[PDB]
Amino acid sequence: ANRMILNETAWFGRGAVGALTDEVKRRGYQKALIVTDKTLVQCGVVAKVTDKMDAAGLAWAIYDGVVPNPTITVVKEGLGVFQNSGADYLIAIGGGSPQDTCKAIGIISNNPEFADVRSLEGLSPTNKPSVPILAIPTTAGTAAEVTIGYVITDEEKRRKFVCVDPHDIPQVAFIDADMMDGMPPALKAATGVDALTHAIEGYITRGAWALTDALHIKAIEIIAGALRGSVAGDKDAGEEMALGQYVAGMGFSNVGVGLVHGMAHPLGAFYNTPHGVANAILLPHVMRYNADFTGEKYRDIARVMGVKVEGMGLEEARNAAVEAVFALNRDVGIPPHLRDVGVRKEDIPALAQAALDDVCTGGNPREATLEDIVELYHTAWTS
Amino acid sequence: MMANRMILNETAWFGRGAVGALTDEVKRRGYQKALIVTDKTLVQCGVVAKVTDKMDAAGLAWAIYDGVVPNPTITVVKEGLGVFQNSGADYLIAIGGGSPQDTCKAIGIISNNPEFADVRSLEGLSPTNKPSVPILAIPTTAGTAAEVTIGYVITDEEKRRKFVCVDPHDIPQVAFIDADMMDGMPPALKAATGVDALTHAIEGYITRGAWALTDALHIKAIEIIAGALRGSVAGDKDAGEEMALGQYVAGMGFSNVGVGLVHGMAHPLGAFYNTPHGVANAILLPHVMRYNADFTGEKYRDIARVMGVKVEGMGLEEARNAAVEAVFALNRDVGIPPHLRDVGVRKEDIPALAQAALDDVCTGGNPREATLEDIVELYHTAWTS
Numbered sequence: 001a002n003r004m005i006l007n008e009t010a011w012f013g014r015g016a017v018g019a020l021t022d023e024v025k026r027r028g029y030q031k032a033l034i035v036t037d038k039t040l041v042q043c044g045v046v047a048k049v050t051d052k053m054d055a056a057g058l059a060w061a062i063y064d065g066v067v068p069n070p071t072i073t074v075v076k077e078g079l080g081v082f083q084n085s086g087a088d089y090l091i092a093i094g095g096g097s098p099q100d101t102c103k104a105i106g107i108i109s110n111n112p113e114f115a116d117v118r119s120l121e122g123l124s125p126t127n128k129p130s131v132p133i134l135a136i137p138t139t140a141g142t143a144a145e146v147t148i149g150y151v152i153t154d155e156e157k158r159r160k161f162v163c164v165d166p167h168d169i170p171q172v173a174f175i176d177a178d179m180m181d182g183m184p185p186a187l188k189a190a191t192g193v194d195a196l197t198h199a200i201e202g203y204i205t206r207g208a209w210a211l212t213d214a215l216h217i218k219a220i221e222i223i224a225g226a227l228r229g230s231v232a233g234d235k236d237a238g239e240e241m242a243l244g245q246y247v248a249g250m251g252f253s254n255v256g257v258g259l260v261h262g263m264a265h266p267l268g269a270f271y272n273t274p275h276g277v278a279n280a281i282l283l284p285h286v287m288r289y290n291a292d293f294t295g296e297k298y299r300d301i302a303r304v305m306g307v308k309v310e311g312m313g314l315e316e317a318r319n320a321a322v323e324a325v326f327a328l329n330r331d332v333g334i335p336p337h338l339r340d341v342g343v344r345k346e347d348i349p350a351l352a353q354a355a356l357d358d359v360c361t362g363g364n365p366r367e368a369t370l371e372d373i374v375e376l377y378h379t380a381w382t383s
Numbered sequence: 384m385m386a387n388r389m390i391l392n393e394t395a396w397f398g399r400g401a402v403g404a405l406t407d408e409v410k411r412r413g414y415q416k417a418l419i420v421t422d423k424t425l426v427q428c429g430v431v432a433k434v435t436d437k438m439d440a441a442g443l444a445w446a447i448y449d450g451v452v453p454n455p456t457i458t459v460v461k462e463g464l465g466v467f468q469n470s471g472a473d474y475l476i477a478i479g480g481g482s483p484q485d486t487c488k489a490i491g492i493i494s495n496n497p498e499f500a501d502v503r504s505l506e507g508l509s510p511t512n513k514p515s516v517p518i519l520a521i522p523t524t525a526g527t528a529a530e531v532t533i534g535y536v537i538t539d540e541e542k543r544r545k546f547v548c549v550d551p552h553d554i555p556q557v558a559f560i561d562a563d564m565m566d567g568m569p570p571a572l573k574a575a576t577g578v579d580a581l582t583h584a585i586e587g588y589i590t591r592g593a594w595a596l597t598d599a600l601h602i603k604a605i606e607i608i609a610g611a612l613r614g615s616v617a618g619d620k621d622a623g624e625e626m627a628l629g630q631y632v633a634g635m636g637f638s639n640v641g642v643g644l645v646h647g648m649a650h651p652l653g654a655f656y657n658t659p660h661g662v663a664n665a666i667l668l669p670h671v672m673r674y675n676a677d678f679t680g681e682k683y684r685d686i687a688r689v690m691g692v693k694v695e696g697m698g699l700e701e702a703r704n705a706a707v708e709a710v711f712a713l714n715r716d717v718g719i720p721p722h723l724r725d726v727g728v729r730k731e732d733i734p735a736l737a738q739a740a741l742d743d744v745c746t747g748g749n750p751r752e753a754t755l756e757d758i759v760e761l762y763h764t765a766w767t768s
């Protein structure tokens with residue numbers, strides 16, 4: 001049988017954060033810890049939530065120490081702030097970095113034997129649900145509001161480790177494109193291709209089944225249709241991206257992804273590369289590598305990305321799906337080569353070993369060898 | 384709010400053998416004793432034993448309430464609540480179709496919200512302060528999607544009416560969608576519960592509150608159901624597993640946005656005659672679709688397309704007629720009677736049925752604003768040739 005973990009409650013649309021104060025009142029919670037970063041406080045994004053909490057008389061504390069590719073240090077600092085604050089629930093405001101930090105804090109607070117954070121890696125054997133999390137994404141996006149995964153950076157061991165745990169699912173998600181409109185175009189582009197990567201890798205993952213296939217192919221259609229308009233600043237395209245990135249998460253959380261994520265994680269660990277940029281550069285090369293192992297699915301992908309696939313042979317339709325991703329990356333201004341974003345050729349053997357050992361790689365429809373992964377990094381390195 | 388809410392199961396298991404996941408879910412949640420809410424047919428047919436045998440093997444305690452009747456009454460809710468309170472159970476397992484699942488939601492809500500002990504005070508947006516007793520839902524029809532909806536429907540025998548209780552607090556904690564639990568449905572019950580599911584998906588697709596996510600879920604559910612129902616009625620194993628998924632996907636949508644006049648007109652037939660819900664919906668659906676057609680934009684082109692009609696280069700009027708005809712054809716193909724007279728409706732009751740339908744909460748979702756005279760005419764149209 002196939003398991004689905006989803007949000008029990010979710011609010012969608014511009015103004016959806018307007019639902020938070022009534023959700024808190026209905027749940028009887030006494031005090032939030034907001035987990036966020038300094039950029040989102042400075043840009044006034046956090047105030048969009050705290051102004052409503054203030055007007056409704058709801059108590060909150062804040063931890064704004066989250067860094068991109070959140071570290072064990074940030075988790076431990078946020079956990080201390082949470083424990084000392086007296087808060088009884090968490091509000092995650094931000095992209096994947098604050099939402100993943102928030103999941104680690106909520107889990108460890110109720111499962112204190114995992115206080116080293118490292119011990120959460122893999123299928124975390126936690127006995128107790130997380131502290132309740134209300135999740136408010138500000139990128140479009142990682143779908144962290146609806147996934148059971150989170151990824152933490154171990155600075156000492158220079159590795160990003162994946163933690164998978166039904167106990168971390170947020171109780172409520174608020175998916176509000178008003179919270180996302182302030183993303184710089186380059187961040188809309190990178191987080192949008194992260195979402196496309198989730199949906200493509202989820203569509204072709206070893207564990208795919210009928211329900212996740214339906215969610216993923218819908219997400220690919222929405223994202224491919226909206227991302228150029230959203231990067232260009234179109235309001236409705238931003239709202240479409242907010243939904244598509246979430247629909248991708250409903251699928252991939254429950255079945256897996258593949259070698260794009262497996263190869264992106266070590267780049268985050270080694271170089272602090274933005275996750276979406278790493279995914280965007282790798283995606284078309286890993287798609288080419290996987291192509292023979294994907295049945296008719298690249299015909300579906302090419303079709304919903306706007307390619308006329310009718311009358312193409314399968315090999316041609318597979319090429320067309322790969323070309324459609326290269327084209328989108330060019331159109332939204334993501335650099336095409338890993339050398340452009342600070343990767344070193346010398347590190348590829350170490351990166352490849354880390355990718356081979358990453359949780360995500362096992363979902364890949366083609367079984368990757370160490371030398372296959374080394375070769376893929378080199379293919380993505382330069383023209 | 385401009386914003387749209389979705390309530391879903393936090394956890395669900397899908398596929399043949401999904402009930403195999405129940406004992407580990409119970410152990411992980413630390414529950415001490417189930418009350419199984421079901422009916423005598425499901426006990427006698429061995430369906431409940433598919434679950435209790437696994438619970439016995441895992442050493443998990445249970446008691447059973449098997450008093451549920453189709454179109455469950457205030458009496459059945461009150462009796463089941465007493466059995467729950469007296470059993471020392473700390474969670475509920477709903478095994479059955481909509482009747483046991485709706486009874487179980489009422490029991491779970493009242494147990495933790497005792498001020499609603501009269502049951503009829505739950506009608507509408509139930510102002511409950513406490514979540515339901517945890518419910519693990521195991522559908523045996525395909526189906527009402529009661530395992531994933533926030534609605535439940537109880538019969539007030541005294542006032543001769545079905546009333547709808549809508550409450551996020553009633554959502555089951557886990558659903559187990561296992562076509563092995565559904566295979567014993569008689570072909571006629573597969574037909575009626577299958578077209579109930581189609582009605583959920585079609586009404587949800589065109590309901591006033593429809594938006595992008597529910598549209599995506601509903602049109603996928605219509606495709607799965609229209610593709611699988613004839614095969615499932617014929618006894619095909621894989622079609623039964625497809626129906627089990629399709630009926631659930633319909634519920635993910637309609638729970639969150641609404642349905643329309645088909646359900647509005649079906650509830651009074653249930654109240655007046657104890658008409659099976661799916662048969663009532665099946666007979667009414669094509670007539671209400673025709674009534675609604677001018678208020679549905681391009682959506683009947685989408686419905687006709689996924690019901691296997693060649694809609695390419697059809698005008699909108701032709702496509703709308705084709706969607707209605709596809710539903711009439713499916714109803715004929717799976718053996719549902721075409722006329723209300725055939726299933727025990729009286730012409731003399733149509734004025735009272737129409738007022739009950741006009742007042743039914745479901746009717747408010749209808750994309751065309753129905754008048755009393757429109758509903759009287761729709762009952763007469765569905766009555767006979």
Ligand SMILES: Nc1ncnc2c1ncn2[C@@H]1O[C@H](COP(=O)(O)OP(=O)(O)OC[C@H]2O[C@@H](O)[C@H](O)[C@@H]2O)[C@@H](O)[C@H]1O
Binds near residue numbers: 067069151
């Ligand atoms: N709406 C916004 N407006 C402006 N800046 C924003 C906004 N949202 C986020 N930012 C900024 O963008 C930067 C990247 O934020 P992240 O949370 O790191 O971005 P995201 O791609 O959502 O998350 C990536 C993280 O999630 C994991 O899936 C992945 O492995 C990685 O750790 C930060 O400086 C953050 O403040």
Ligand SMILES: Nc1ncnc2c1ncn2[C@@H]1O[C@H](COP(=O)(O)OP(=O)(O)OC[C@H]2O[C@@H](O)[C@H](O)[C@@H]2O)[C@@H](O)[C@H]1O
Binds near residue numbers: 422430
């Ligand atoms: N797998 C099965 N095998 C055999 N008989 C079955 C099975 N499942 C159900 N039945 C029998 O089918 C009959 C109808 O069961 P219901 O639970 O009433 O049917 P269903 O259509 O699922 O639910 C209808 C109810 O739900 C509400 O949405 C609606 O308003 C109505 O009250 C009962 O006699 C029941 O025992």
Ligand SMILES: [Fe+3]
Binds near residue numbers: 142198261275279
């Ligand atoms: Fe990602």
Ligand SMILES: [Fe+3]
Binds near residue numbers: 583660664
């Ligand atoms: Fe129904």
